[PDB]
Amino acid sequence: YKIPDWFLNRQKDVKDGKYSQVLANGLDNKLREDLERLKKIRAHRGLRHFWGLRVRGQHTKTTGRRGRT
Amino acid sequence: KKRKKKSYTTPKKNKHKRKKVKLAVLKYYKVDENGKISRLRRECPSDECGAGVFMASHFDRHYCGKCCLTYCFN
Amino acid sequence: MLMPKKNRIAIYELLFKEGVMVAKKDVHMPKHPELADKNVPNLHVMKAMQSLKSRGYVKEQFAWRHFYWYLTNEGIQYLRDYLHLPPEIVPATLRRS
Amino acid sequence: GHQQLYWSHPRKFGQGSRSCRVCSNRHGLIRKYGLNMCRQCFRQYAKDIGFIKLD
Amino acid sequence: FRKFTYRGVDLDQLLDMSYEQLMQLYSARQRRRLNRGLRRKQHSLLKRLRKAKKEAPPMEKPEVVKTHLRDMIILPEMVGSMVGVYNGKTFNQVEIKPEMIGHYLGEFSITYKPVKHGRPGIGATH
RNA sequence: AGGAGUGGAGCCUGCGGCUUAAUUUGACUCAACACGGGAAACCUCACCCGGCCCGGACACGGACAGGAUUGACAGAUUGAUA
RNA sequence: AGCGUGUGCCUACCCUACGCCGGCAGGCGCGGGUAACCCGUUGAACCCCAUUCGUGAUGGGGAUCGGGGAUUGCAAUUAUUCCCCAUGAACGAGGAAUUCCCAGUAAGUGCGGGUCAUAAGCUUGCGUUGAUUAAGUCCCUGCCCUUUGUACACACCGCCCGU
Incomplete structure (x- = not known):
C-alpha cells in the first residue's frame, strides 16, 4: 500500500533481510535476538552491550551511579 | 630520557653488512686458450639501464636494473 | 648516508652564487x-649544516624555523680550495646595495 | 633518507599538519587571517603585525 | 532444510559474483575505503596468507596471524582464516567465524586490564 | 526587595589507581575543578610496546681504499613499502 | 536585522547563488564573490489559527536499545561527524548551602569566529524582548583606614612556658 523501503525498521540486515512488520513485539523479539547473538559471539561491542555499556557514541562519566549493583 | 634497560636485547646490534669484498675473481673468467673476453651481460629494453650494469650470479636468474624484470625458463 | 658529491658541488655552487640556500x-x-x-x-x-658548524667556515643563525649562514672570507677560501674553482670566482656585485 | 618508513600515513587533516610558525608549537594555534600563530608568540608580536589593544 | 546466510545473501551466491561486485553490492558500509580504493601491490599479504595456510595443519583452521589491519570479505573459499586478538602484543587463538572477520576492530577480547576497586570512599576521595 | 544552579535527572576537564602495551607533566580557597585556548580516530604524548637511526660533529689515532650497503622483490616478513 | 567571516603559495582543504539526481546524508554542471561588487535585501528565534494535544508518563521529553547513512581526506573501534522508524528511564520547583545580577541591565532565545579534514553543551563577539524591582546600609562576607595593645619583626602558620 505504497509505503517506501526507507520509513521502516526491518530493512535488510545481518543473517537474512527482515520483511513484514507485525503486531506488538513480533519483530522486536527478532531485533532483540540479534542482540542476543551479539552477546553470544563474544564481540567487543556485543560484550559491552551485555555489560550494560551503550556503544553508539555514549560517553560514561555519570551513568551507572544510582542503583548500580 | 635515560637508559630503560634495553642493553640485554640485541647485544650491540650490528649495522647491516652482508659481505666484505676486495677483488672479484670467480666472476672474471676470460680463459679460452686465447685470452678473449667472456661475458654474460643481459639487459631490459630501456635507456636508463644497459649492458654496463652488473649482474647477480645465479643458476637461473637475471637481476637487471630496478624494473624487476622476471624472465624465467619455467 | 652516502651523501652525493654531485649534490654537494651543486649546493656549494648555489651557496657561492648569492650567499644563502633554502634550508629547512x-x-x-x-x-x-x-x-x-x-x-x-x-x-x-x-x-651540510652540521659539517659547516663543526668546520666553522660559515656561522649559523636560526630564526622562525629557518637557517642562515654567514659566508666568511675563510669560507670562500676553503670552498675554492676544496672545489678547486678558479680564483676569480667571488660574489662581488655592487649595484643597488 | 628516511623515506621508506615515514610517509606511511599522510598527514594533511590533523593538528600535526599545522604548527606555530615560530616555535613549531602545535598547541594553541591561531589560524584566523592566515596568522598561523600561537597565543604566546602572537601576543609577543602583536604590535608588529598591526593589531593594537584599544577596545 | 535451509542454507547458510550472510546479511541476506547466500553462500554459493557469495561465491557467485566477483570481488568488486561483492564489495559494491554488499550491505551498508565497509565498502567506502575500497570504493575510493585500497592501494595495489597487495600481493605480499596474499603470499603471507598462502604461507600461513601451508603451515596450517590440514583439515584445520589457518593458524594465528600477527596482522593489525582490518580485514575484508572475499569468496567464502578462504574467508575464515583465523586472525588473533591484539592484547598488547599477542594474538589470542579465538574461534572467529567468517561472519565476524573484517568487522570493527581485531581485538575480539578485552582491551584494558581493570584495576582492583574498593568501596566508594577512601579510594574515591582525597 | 526580586530574577537562578544543588544532597533535584543524561552529557564536558582534572584526583586514590591503570599489576594491560599505557595519564603522573598544575592546584587542599577565592586567585585549581568547559583552565593550560586541552573538541588527541591515528598525526599533537616522546609518554607506553622489536618506538628504521650513527644521523653519539671529535680532523680522536691508526691499520685499509673497500671506511663500507640509510635499498624493495623468498622458509631472508605468520605486521601491503618494517 | 546585528556582529562579522569567506576563493590559499606550505593544501581540493572557503562562503556558495542557480537548475538535475532522492522523503535522506551527498554527487553533477555553469560558476557569483580576492568582497558595501556574490552568498545577502544575510526571508531562523518569534507574532497568528471561523479543524485536530487535555493533567498521561506522556507528541512538556532521550542510550526514543536496533537497523537503513556516508564527505574530490587512512581507514568513526565504549565508534566526539552523521537525514529515517514506537516504546524509557527521570522531573510535580528541586529539605542543606547559596553563585551572578545598577536600564536595552537580568531573563527569553539564534547567528559569527577560536574551535574545524566534517565537529559545539565550551568559549569569544553579535543583534534579537523588556521587567515589580535599588538611589540604600554595614546585618553577613570580605577589604581599607584610624585609635589601641604587643614579650611578634622568619612578623600569629609568630613567640613562648612547664612536665
Whole structure:
C-alpha cells in the first residue's frame, strides 16, 4: 500500500533481510535476538552491550551511579 | 630520557653488512686458450639501464636494473 | 648516508652564487621546490649544516624555523680550495646595495 | 633518507599538519587571517603585525 | 532444510559474483575505503596468507596471524582464516567465524586490564 | 526587595589507581575543578610496546681504499613499502 | 536585522547563488564573490489559527536499545561527524548551602569566529524582548583606614612556658 523501503525498521540486515512488520513485539523479539547473538559471539561491542555499556557514541562519566549493583 | 634497560636485547646490534669484498675473481673468467673476453651481460629494453650494469650470479636468474624484470625458463 | 658529491658541488655552487640556500629541517617535505630536481632531501641539509658548524667556515643563525649562514672570507677560501674553482670566482656585485 | 618508513600515513587533516610558525608549537594555534600563530608568540608580536589593544 | 546466510545473501551466491561486485553490492558500509580504493601491490599479504595456510595443519583452521589491519570479505573459499586478538602484543587463538572477520576492530577480547576497586570512599576521595 | 544552579535527572576537564602495551607533566580557597585556548580516530604524548637511526660533529689515532650497503622483490616478513 | 567571516603559495582543504539526481546524508554542471561588487535585501528565534494535544508518563521529553547513512581526506573501534522508524528511564520547583545580577541591565532565545579534514553543551563577539524591582546600609562576607595593645619583626602558620 505504497509505503517506501526507507520509513521502516526491518530493512535488510545481518543473517537474512527482515520483511513484514507485525503486531506488538513480533519483530522486536527478532531485533532483540540479534542482540542476543551479539552477546553470544563474544564481540567487543556485543560484550559491552551485555555489560550494560551503550556503544553508539555514549560517553560514561555519570551513568551507572544510582542503583548500580 | 635515560637508559630503560634495553642493553640485554640485541647485544650491540650490528649495522647491516652482508659481505666484505676486495677483488672479484670467480666472476672474471676470460680463459679460452686465447685470452678473449667472456661475458654474460643481459639487459631490459630501456635507456636508463644497459649492458654496463652488473649482474647477480645465479643458476637461473637475471637481476637487471630496478624494473624487476622476471624472465624465467619455467 | 652516502651523501652525493654531485649534490654537494651543486649546493656549494648555489651557496657561492648569492650567499644563502633554502634550508629547512622539516622531513614531511622530501624536497623543497627550489631544492628539487637535484636529489636534495632533508638529511642533505642537515649534514651540510652540521659539517659547516663543526668546520666553522660559515656561522649559523636560526630564526622562525629557518637557517642562515654567514659566508666568511675563510669560507670562500676553503670552498675554492676544496672545489678547486678558479680564483676569480667571488660574489662581488655592487649595484643597488 | 628516511623515506621508506615515514610517509606511511599522510598527514594533511590533523593538528600535526599545522604548527606555530615560530616555535613549531602545535598547541594553541591561531589560524584566523592566515596568522598561523600561537597565543604566546602572537601576543609577543602583536604590535608588529598591526593589531593594537584599544577596545 | 535451509542454507547458510550472510546479511541476506547466500553462500554459493557469495561465491557467485566477483570481488568488486561483492564489495559494491554488499550491505551498508565497509565498502567506502575500497570504493575510493585500497592501494595495489597487495600481493605480499596474499603470499603471507598462502604461507600461513601451508603451515596450517590440514583439515584445520589457518593458524594465528600477527596482522593489525582490518580485514575484508572475499569468496567464502578462504574467508575464515583465523586472525588473533591484539592484547598488547599477542594474538589470542579465538574461534572467529567468517561472519565476524573484517568487522570493527581485531581485538575480539578485552582491551584494558581493570584495576582492583574498593568501596566508594577512601579510594574515591582525597 | 526580586530574577537562578544543588544532597533535584543524561552529557564536558582534572584526583586514590591503570599489576594491560599505557595519564603522573598544575592546584587542599577565592586567585585549581568547559583552565593550560586541552573538541588527541591515528598525526599533537616522546609518554607506553622489536618506538628504521650513527644521523653519539671529535680532523680522536691508526691499520685499509673497500671506511663500507640509510635499498624493495623468498622458509631472508605468520605486521601491503618494517 | 546585528556582529562579522569567506576563493590559499606550505593544501581540493572557503562562503556558495542557480537548475538535475532522492522523503535522506551527498554527487553533477555553469560558476557569483580576492568582497558595501556574490552568498545577502544575510526571508531562523518569534507574532497568528471561523479543524485536530487535555493533567498521561506522556507528541512538556532521550542510550526514543536496533537497523537503513556516508564527505574530490587512512581507514568513526565504549565508534566526539552523521537525514529515517514506537516504546524509557527521570522531573510535580528541586529539605542543606547559596553563585551572578545598577536600564536595552537580568531573563527569553539564534547567528559569527577560536574551535574545524566534517565537529559545539565550551568559549569569544553579535543583534534579537523588556521587567515589580535599588538611589540604600554595614546585618553577613570580605577589604581599607584610624585609635589601641604587643614579650611578634622568619612578623600569629609568630613567640613562648612547664612536665
